Design a protein around this ligand. Structure first.
Ligand SMILES: Nc1nc2c(ncn2[C@@H]2O[C@@H]3COP(=O)(O)O[C@H]4[C@@H](O)[C@H](n5cnc6c(=O)[nH]c(N)nc65)O[C@@H]4COP(=O)(O)O[C@H]3[C@H]2O)c(=O)[nH]1
Ligand SMILES: Nc1nc2c(ncn2[C@@H]2O[C@@H]3COP(=O)(O)O[C@H]4[C@@H](O)[C@H](n5cnc6c(=O)[nH]c(N)nc65)O[C@@H]4COP(=O)(O)O[C@H]3[C@H]2O)c(=O)[nH]1
Ligand SMILES: [Cl-]
Ligand SMILES: [Cl-]
Lengths: 108, 108
């Protein structure tokens, strides 16, 4: 089957996005990679295939990092309700920043 | 004489700090390294040796990055009024983030 191209890590990050019902959602990430992320479903029902826009926020020590993102929902786990999402249209510098963030956590 | 330990780059960054007269200062950086930065003097007079606290802000693409910092003024150029500053008490993760930021610009 398909191969994982980007390592996934747990870290202190959140996604803020506008849901299907036009209500804001502020969800903590289950994990992050340079390709996408996962979070637990809440708010309006979430259907794989749907496109969203939001802001990924990371904070540690005295660092705040935010990235505007677009994402597609790829899957929802029918037990845990983990929503697996794929970033769309990241710029090369954005991918590289995410990779730095990820690898710095993996390394630690 | 003393040796430069950290490479310096120009990038889109600013420092926001509270000046000697208790007034906010928002200055664009002349350059940045993992050790410190430079900006052009403005506001209250700035005397080498003095300690300040502030927030270093970086923005590019859809990325916003901010770091709380402490710094000591090391020098003021008597012609250009460039204020050369040294970060104090950075945590290892903060130094590593700055280094990533710097090297990514040098590389480009
Ligand atoms: N951080 C994170 N990102 C997510 C998650 N779900 C989806 N993504 C992102 O969306 C891309 C596509 O996911 P996919 O449709 O599940 O498509 C996946 C899936 O079919 C498969 N795959 C990846 N990891 C595994 C695995 O551990 N086992 C199996 N059997 N398949 C995997 O390879 C495809 C490509 O994987 P990636 O390169 O990682 O590319 C992923 C990844 O960037 C998630 O829960 N967390
Ligand atoms: N980005 C930036 N950071 C600044 C600036 N001024 C001071 N800093 C920071 O403050 C530290 C000490 O600066 P210094 O007292 O001038 O002390 C300096 C200075 O005495 C000397 N030095 C550094 N670069 C040069 C150079 O190109 N020529 C000469 N002659 N001396 C240099 O080596 C010492 C250590 O340098 P660093 O390791 O870089 O360590 C620097 C650096 O982290 C600045 O204009 N921009
Ligand atoms: Cl992995
Ligand atoms: Cl240099």
């Amino acid at each position: 089957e398909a191969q994982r191209q980007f390592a996934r890590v747990k870290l202190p990050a959140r996604i803020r996005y506008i849901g299907a019902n036009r209500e804001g959602v502020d969800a903590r990430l289950l994990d992050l990679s340079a390709g996408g992320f996962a979070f637990t479903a809440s708010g309006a029902p979430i259907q794989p295939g749907d496109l969203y826009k939001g802001k990924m926020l990371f904070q540690v020590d005295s660092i705040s990092f935010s990235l505007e993102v677009e994402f597609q929902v790829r899957s929802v786990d029918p037990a845990s309700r983990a929503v697996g999402c794929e970033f769309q249209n990241l710029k090369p510098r954005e991918v590289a920043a995410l990779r730095y963030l990820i690898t710095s956590y993996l390394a630690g």
